[PDB]
Swiss-Prot record, chains A, B:
Segments on the Periplasmic side according to the record's topology features: 10-157
Stretch of the intact protein here: 26 to 181 of 553
Record's protein name: Methyl-accepting chemotaxis protein II
General function of this protein: Receptor for the attractant L-aspartate and related amino and dicarboxylic acids. Tar mediates taxis away from the repellents cobalt and nickel. Unlike in E.coli tar, it does not mediate maltose taxis.
Location of the protein in the cell: Cell inner membrane
Lineage, uppermost ranks: Bacteria, Pseudomonadati, Pseudomonadota, Gammaproteobacteria, Enterobacterales
Native source organism of the sequence: Salmonella typhimurium (strain LT2 / SGSC1412 / ATCC 700720)
Stretches for region The 3 Arg may form a positively charged pocket, which binds the alpha-carboxyl group of the attractant AA: 40-49
Amino acid sequence: MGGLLFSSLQHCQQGFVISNELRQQQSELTSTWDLMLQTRINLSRSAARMMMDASNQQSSAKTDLLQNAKTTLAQAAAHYANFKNMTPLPAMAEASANVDEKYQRYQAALAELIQFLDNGNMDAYFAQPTQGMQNALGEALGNYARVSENLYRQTFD
Amino acid sequence: MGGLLFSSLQHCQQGFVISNELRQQQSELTSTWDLMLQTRINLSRSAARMMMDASNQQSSAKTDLLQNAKTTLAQAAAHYANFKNMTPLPAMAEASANVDEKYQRYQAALAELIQFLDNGNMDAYFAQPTQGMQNALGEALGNYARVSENLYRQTFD
Ligand SMILES: c1cnc2c(c1)ccc1cccnc12
Ligand SMILES: N[C@@H](CC(=O)O)C(=O)O
């Protein structure tokens, strides 16, 4: 014996196998979130430029930042697909189902804001309560993280 | 049964010591980038609102938004302090170094724009090259994730 947080190599390797998977699935959800907030930033960046005051030229001035929001949303959907494809560990089943619901709602909302700016509808872009769908997903993400944490801690025992 | 990824309980334990610290480092770094990105979305949602009410809409949430970016920015810096307070691992020292530089620089970009927006000066806001610096830190963070992953893989088979 010369081991300390684990009762045997079997136990130790067990915890590794369980944690390395939690680590993969939490990684895809960090990237999803990152590129979804990147999409909301590019959308704001497009709209401010849309809004710069030439006269009757109106709110639609050379914005290649909307294609940029279309790209970061597609990449977040790519990271999300990997997670979605990864079946929940039993203990995780419900934390993930919650993150999928809050995610389908916030991706819809961002895709909805791209079509608004795409058709020049500024008021609809400004009026969407995007912040609540984001806060909801942020809160289902910290909960999924509490629940991985708990399972991670149960390995060194 | 199975097949082992570790030649002994000490080899396995040694990987856990490394991995668990890497895990913590990375948690605070992701939490810094998150909050910096919500500061950016708060600032940009305020700057688009500062340009309204001029034959266009609502405007009034732009200082709630500006007060909320001061908070996410203070939360971002407290997270980075946790990360700075941690033991830099030899394999991570260079990556860590590159992250500090780019961090320091974007935190300070963000803080100037809060100031410009407090003064109501839109022109100062758009004259600042924020996105450059944000992409710079996204890059350094990607590299750090890349070098972090390398060290973690060598912890097993
Ligand atoms: C490498 C990486 N993670 C670990 C180990 C080795 C060993 C055990 C273990 C237990 C719980 C969580 N992670 C690990
Ligand atoms: N509703 C959009 C745009 C805005 O309010 O500025 C958002 O929250 O991103």
